[PDB]
Structure 1
Amino acid sequence: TPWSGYLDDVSAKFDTGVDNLQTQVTEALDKLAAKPSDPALLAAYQSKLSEYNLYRNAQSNTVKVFKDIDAAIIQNFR
């Protein structure tokens, strides 16, 4: 069984919170690269890329906060 800590479970909630955003970004890029002059494909790709940008930034900053909460408590043991 692969072990998962508390910081893993926080980062897992973003991964399960979006259904297939990792799939939808890759598929929208492949349709865009086939014909990069379609306004229907450009506006669709702008939405999914900007959505994926806010996805990783909210994920990585959240893990950073819970790390600093835990490190402040462990220091007060000794």
Structure 2
Amino acid sequence: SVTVPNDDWTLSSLSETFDDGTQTLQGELTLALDKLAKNPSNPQLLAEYQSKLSEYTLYRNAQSNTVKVIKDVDAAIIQNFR
């Protein structure tokens, strides 16, 4: 009915956000990676550069965790499932 397309609408929008967030993550990923290379001097950038991301605790570093970066996008649809 009307109801159905609602879900499509919501899902569509929702999925949209997910992609955006991930892509945003991608964007950051570029930045993060660049920084370390750019400025070797400060190890911290590197430290940030490589890390795991716990959601709350950690600062996600896209480059550091390949899985994380990839994970979000694929994850997101799973999240959609959730």
Give TM-score, length-normalised by structure 2: 0.43
Give TM-score, length-normalised by structure 1: 0.44
